[PDB]
Design a protein around this motif. Structure first.
Motif, PDB file in Angstrom:
ATOM      1  N   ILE A   1       0.846  -1.230   0.000  1.00 41.42           N
ATOM      2  CA  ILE A   1       0.000   0.000   0.000  1.00 41.42           C
ATOM      3  C   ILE A   1       0.865   1.258   0.000  1.00 41.42           C
ATOM      4  O   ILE A   1       0.566   2.227  -0.681  1.00 41.42           O
ATOM      5  CB  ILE A   1      -0.924   0.056   1.245  1.00 41.42           C
ATOM      6  CG1 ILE A   1      -1.789  -1.204   1.327  1.00 41.42           C
ATOM      7  CG2 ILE A   1      -1.818   1.284   1.172  1.00 41.42           C
ATOM      8  CD1 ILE A   1      -1.214  -2.291   2.212  1.00 41.42           C
ATOM      9  N   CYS A   2       1.945   1.226   0.772  1.00 40.94           N
ATOM     10  CA  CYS A   2       2.788   2.397   0.971  1.00 40.94           C
ATOM     11  C   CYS A   2       3.344   2.976  -0.328  1.00 40.94           C
ATOM     12  O   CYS A   2       3.503   4.183  -0.453  1.00 40.94           O
ATOM     13  CB  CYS A   2       3.947   2.055   1.908  1.00 40.94           C
ATOM     14  SG  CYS A   2       3.483   1.806   3.653  1.00 40.94           S
ATOM     15  N   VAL A   3       3.638   2.109  -1.291  1.00 45.24           N
ATOM     16  CA  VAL A   3       4.238   2.545  -2.546  1.00 45.24           C
ATOM     17  C   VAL A   3       3.336   3.511  -3.316  1.00 45.24           C
ATOM     18  O   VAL A   3       3.823   4.398  -4.011  1.00 45.24           O
ATOM     19  CB  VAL A   3       4.559   1.341  -3.457  1.00 45.24           C
ATOM     20  CG1 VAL A   3       5.256   1.818  -4.719  1.00 45.24           C
ATOM     21  CG2 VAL A   3       5.430   0.340  -2.709  1.00 45.24           C
ATOM     22  N   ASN A   4       2.024   3.334  -3.184  1.00 44.79           N
ATOM     23  CA  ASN A   4       1.056   4.129  -3.935  1.00 44.79           C
ATOM     24  C   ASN A   4       0.489   5.264  -3.093  1.00 44.79           C
ATOM     25  O   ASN A   4      -0.157   5.026  -2.080  1.00 44.79           O
ATOM     26  CB  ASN A   4      -0.088   3.236  -4.413  1.00 44.79           C
ATOM     27  CG  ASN A   4       0.403   1.948  -5.039  1.00 44.79           C
ATOM     28  OD1 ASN A   4       1.222   1.963  -5.955  1.00 44.79           O
ATOM     29  ND2 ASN A   4      -0.092   0.822  -4.540  1.00 44.79           N
ATOM     30  N   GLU A   5       0.731   6.498  -3.528  1.00 49.13           N
ATOM     31  CA  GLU A   5       0.274   7.685  -2.811  1.00 49.13           C
ATOM     32  C   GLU A   5       0.650   7.672  -1.329  1.00 49.13           C
ATOM     33  O   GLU A   5      -0.090   8.181  -0.487  1.00 49.13           O
ATOM     34  CB  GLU A   5      -1.241   7.841  -2.959  1.00 49.13           C
ATOM     35  CG  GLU A   5      -1.688   8.184  -4.372  1.00 49.13           C
ATOM     36  CD  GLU A   5      -3.186   8.394  -4.475  1.00 49.13           C
ATOM     37  OE1 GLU A   5      -3.619   9.181  -5.346  1.00 49.13           O
ATOM     38  OE2 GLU A   5      -3.931   7.772  -3.685  1.00 49.13           O
ATOM     39  N   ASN A   6       1.807   7.086  -1.027  1.00 52.44           N
ATOM     40  CA  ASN A   6       2.341   7.035   0.333  1.00 52.44           C
ATOM     41  C   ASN A   6       1.385   6.345   1.310  1.00 52.44           C
ATOM     42  O   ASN A   6       1.375   6.653   2.504  1.00 52.44           O
ATOM     43  CB  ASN A   6       2.654   8.447   0.829  1.00 52.44           C
ATOM     44  CG  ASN A   6       3.601   8.449   2.012  1.00 52.44           C
ATOM     45  OD1 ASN A   6       4.466   7.586   2.126  1.00 52.44           O
ATOM     46  ND2 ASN A   6       3.436   9.420   2.901  1.00 52.44           N
ATOM     47  N   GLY A   7       0.582   5.418   0.793  1.00 54.89           N
ATOM     48  CA  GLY A   7      -0.362   4.695   1.626  1.00 54.89           C
ATOM     49  C   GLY A   7      -1.446   5.557   2.248  1.00 54.89           C
ATOM     50  O   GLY A   7      -2.144   5.112   3.149  1.00 54.89           O
ATOM     51  N   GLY A   8      -1.588   6.788   1.768  1.00 57.04           N
ATOM     52  CA  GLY A   8      -2.520   7.720   2.377  1.00 57.04           C
ATOM     53  C   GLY A   8      -1.953   8.463   3.580  1.00 57.04           C
ATOM     54  O   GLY A   8      -2.597   9.357   4.116  1.00 57.04           O
ATOM     55  N   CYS A   9      -0.742   8.099   3.996  1.00 54.88           N
ATOM     56  CA  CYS A   9      -0.120   8.679   5.185  1.00 54.88           C
ATOM     57  C   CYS A   9       0.326  10.120   4.956  1.00 54.88           C
ATOM     58  O   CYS A   9       0.758  10.480   3.863  1.00 54.88           O
ATOM     59  CB  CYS A   9       1.098   7.850   5.604  1.00 54.88           C
ATOM     60  SG  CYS A   9       0.787   6.097   5.998  1.00 54.88           S
ATOM     61  N   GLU A  10       0.234  10.942   5.996  1.00 58.08           N
ATOM     62  CA  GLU A  10       0.723  12.312   5.912  1.00 58.08           C
ATOM     63  C   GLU A  10       2.250  12.361   5.959  1.00 58.08           C
ATOM     64  O   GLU A  10       2.862  13.197   5.302  1.00 58.08           O
ATOM     65  CB  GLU A  10       0.148  13.167   7.047  1.00 58.08           C
ATOM     66  CG  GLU A  10       0.572  14.634   6.983  1.00 58.08           C
ATOM     67  CD  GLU A  10       0.003  15.471   8.124  1.00 58.08           C
ATOM     68  OE1 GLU A  10      -1.161  15.245   8.516  1.00 58.08           O
ATOM     69  OE2 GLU A  10       0.725  16.361   8.625  1.00 58.08           O
ATOM     70  N   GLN A  11       2.856  11.468   6.737  1.00 55.37           N
ATOM     71  CA  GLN A  11       4.309  11.396   6.824  1.00 55.37           C
ATOM     72  C   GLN A  11       4.861  10.020   6.447  1.00 55.37           C
ATOM     73  O   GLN A  11       5.033   9.736   5.271  1.00 55.37           O
ATOM     74  CB  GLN A  11       4.774  11.823   8.226  1.00 55.37           C
ATOM     75  CG  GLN A  11       4.461  13.295   8.520  1.00 55.37           C
ATOM     76  CD  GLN A  11       5.052  13.806   9.829  1.00 55.37           C
ATOM     77  OE1 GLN A  11       5.763  13.096  10.526  1.00 55.37           O
ATOM     78  NE2 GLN A  11       4.753  15.056  10.159  1.00 55.37           N
ATOM     79  N   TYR A  12       5.136   9.161   7.424  1.00 55.48           N
ATOM     80  CA  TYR A  12       5.787   7.888   7.114  1.00 55.48           C
ATOM     81  C   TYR A  12       4.793   6.735   7.026  1.00 55.48           C
ATOM     82  O   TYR A  12       3.736   6.772   7.643  1.00 55.48           O
ATOM     83  CB  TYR A  12       6.853   7.556   8.158  1.00 55.48           C
ATOM     84  CG  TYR A  12       7.843   8.674   8.406  1.00 55.48           C
ATOM     85  CD1 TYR A  12       8.338   9.438   7.356  1.00 55.48           C
ATOM     86  CD2 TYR A  12       8.283   8.962   9.693  1.00 55.48           C
ATOM     87  CE1 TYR A  12       9.245  10.462   7.582  1.00 55.48           C
ATOM     88  CE2 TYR A  12       9.189   9.982   9.927  1.00 55.48           C
ATOM     89  CZ  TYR A  12       9.666  10.727   8.869  1.00 55.48           C
ATOM     90  OH  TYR A  12      10.576  11.733   9.097  1.00 55.48           O
ATOM     91  N   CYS A  13       5.155   5.715   6.254  1.00 60.39           N
ATOM     92  CA  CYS A  13       4.273   4.579   5.996  1.00 60.39           C
ATOM     93  C   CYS A  13       5.046   3.269   6.138  1.00 60.39           C
ATOM     94  O   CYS A  13       6.124   3.115   5.575  1.00 60.39           O
ATOM     95  CB  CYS A  13       3.697   4.695   4.581  1.00 60.39           C
ATOM     96  SG  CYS A  13       2.421   3.476   4.109  1.00 60.39           S
ATOM     97  N   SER A  14       4.488   2.333   6.900  1.00 59.04           N
ATOM     98  CA  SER A  14       5.038   0.985   6.989  1.00 59.04           C
ATOM     99  C   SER A  14       4.037  -0.036   6.466  1.00 59.04           C
ATOM    100  O   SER A  14       2.854   0.006   6.807  1.00 59.04           O
ATOM    101  CB  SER A  14       5.397   0.642   8.436  1.00 59.04           C
ATOM    102  OG  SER A  14       6.481   1.430   8.893  1.00 59.04           O
ATOM    103  N   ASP A  15       4.520  -0.951   5.634  1.00 56.24           N
ATOM    104  CA  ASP A  15       3.686  -2.027   5.117  1.00 56.24           C
ATOM    105  C   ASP A  15       3.685  -3.203   6.083  1.00 56.24           C
ATOM    106  O   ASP A  15       4.706  -3.525   6.680  1.00 56.24           O
ATOM    107  CB  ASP A  15       4.203  -2.490   3.752  1.00 56.24           C
ATOM    108  CG  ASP A  15       4.044  -1.432   2.680  1.00 56.24           C
ATOM    109  OD1 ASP A  15       2.892  -1.166   2.276  1.00 56.24           O
ATOM    110  OD2 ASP A  15       5.070  -0.868   2.239  1.00 56.24           O
TER     111      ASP A  15
END
Ligand code: 1GG
Ligand code: CA
Lengths: 55, 254
Positions: free
Chosen positions: A1-15
């Protein structure tokens, strides 16, 4: 998920395993209950410009 | 900075000025209260390590207004892979002797996680570059902090869009190009070490370091910047380690 549009996260994203995603924030920020937004927890968080923020 | 504008006082609060014996040396970026990121090549000719000073909250070099904070630089850390006088791995991590005090005019820029920077930040087209460097190729340096908005491009597109000099250094995986090839806008000598800063969802992040180029705003050429995302882990590990005696430290990279 993180790869696409940063997973929706405002800052950091973990899969995580299949469909699971956890957003995180830089030090000086906390994650809101929406699971994506970060809000400052200190007076001078990194990357914010005080005279514009107080503007 | 060529072709930019004055950064309104306080709107570039992470900008650092480095001085040696009182003289302008380079720029830098504050990333928390004691650590500054700059360019390794800024320190090639330094013999007087105890005369190296970082100034935060600076804006106009002609007048002290009280928002400036000066700190001695306790350590300069450079990657083992950097070779003085050459372009690759052009990054330095500076520890201040005492923390700066965060204020409206002194605020760190966020050092991003690597994944976030590679997957997301690297695709924000425009970012800001800042400094008190030369206002034009072969010209005088600026008295007020200048800032310029520049577009980032893929290195493939850089090499293809640039006029071939042949002798020019290779653009490695540890660099990226940004700016304009029409000779109008660029960073310049004296800006080295300063921030290339990228905005995303309301917050600014460190993505580049003013590093090198062919002249300044030379037709057919772009500015070249150190690709900070390659160094995130290296920087983080160093910031969590205890200081060692001696100002200059070479630290293994990766
Ligand atoms: C990185 C090591 C050094 C060592 C002198 C330092 C550096 C330098 O002068 N940086 C200041 C500088 C900063 C920004 C720009 C720009 N965006 N146009 C140009 C110059 N530099 C170097 C080298 Cl070996 N070669 C450079 N450029 C070359 C391609 C034509 C010569 C260069 O700019
Ligand atoms: Ca001043």
């Amino acid at each position: 998920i993180c790869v696409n549009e940063n997973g929706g996260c405002e800052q950091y994203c973990s899969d995580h395993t299949g469909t699971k995603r956890s957003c995180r924030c830089h030090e000086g920020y906390s994650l809101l209950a929406d699971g994506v937004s970060c809000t400052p927890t200190v007076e001078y968080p990194c990357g914010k410009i005080p005279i514009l923020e107080k503007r | 900075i060529v072709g930019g504008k004055v950064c309104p006082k306080g709107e570039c609060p992470w900008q650092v000025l480095l001085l040696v014996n009182g003289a302008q040396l380079c720029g830098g970026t504050l990333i928390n209260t004691i650590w500054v990121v700059s360019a390794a090549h800024c320190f090639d000719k330094i013999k007087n390590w105890r005369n190296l000073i970082a100034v935060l909250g600076e804006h106009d070099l002609s007048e002290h207004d009280g928002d400036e904070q000066s700190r001695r630089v306790a350590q300069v850390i450079i990657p083992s892979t950097y070779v003085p006088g050459t372009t690759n791995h052009d990054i330095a991590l500076l520890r201040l002797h005492q923390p700066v005090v965060l204020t409206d005019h002194v605020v760190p820029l966020c050092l991003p996680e690597r994944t976030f920077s590679e997957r997301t930040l690297a695709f924000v087209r425009f970012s800001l570059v800042s400094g008190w460097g030369q206002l034009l190729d072969r010209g005088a340096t600026a008295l007020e902090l200048m800032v310029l908005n520049v577009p980032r491009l893929m290195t493939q597109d850089c090499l293809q869009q640039s006029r071939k000099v042949g002798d020019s250094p290779n653009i490695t995986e540890y660099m990226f190009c940004a700016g304009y090839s029409d000779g109008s806008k660029d960073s310049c000598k004296g800006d080295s070490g300063g921030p290339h800063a990228t905005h995303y969802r309301g917050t600014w992040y460190l993505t580049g370091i003013v590093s090198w180029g062919q002249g300044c705003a030379t037709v057919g050429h772009f500015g070249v910047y150190t690709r900070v995302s390659q160094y995130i882990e290296w920087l983080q590990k160093l910031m969590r380690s205890e200081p060692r005696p001696g100002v200059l430290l070479r630290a293994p990279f990766p």
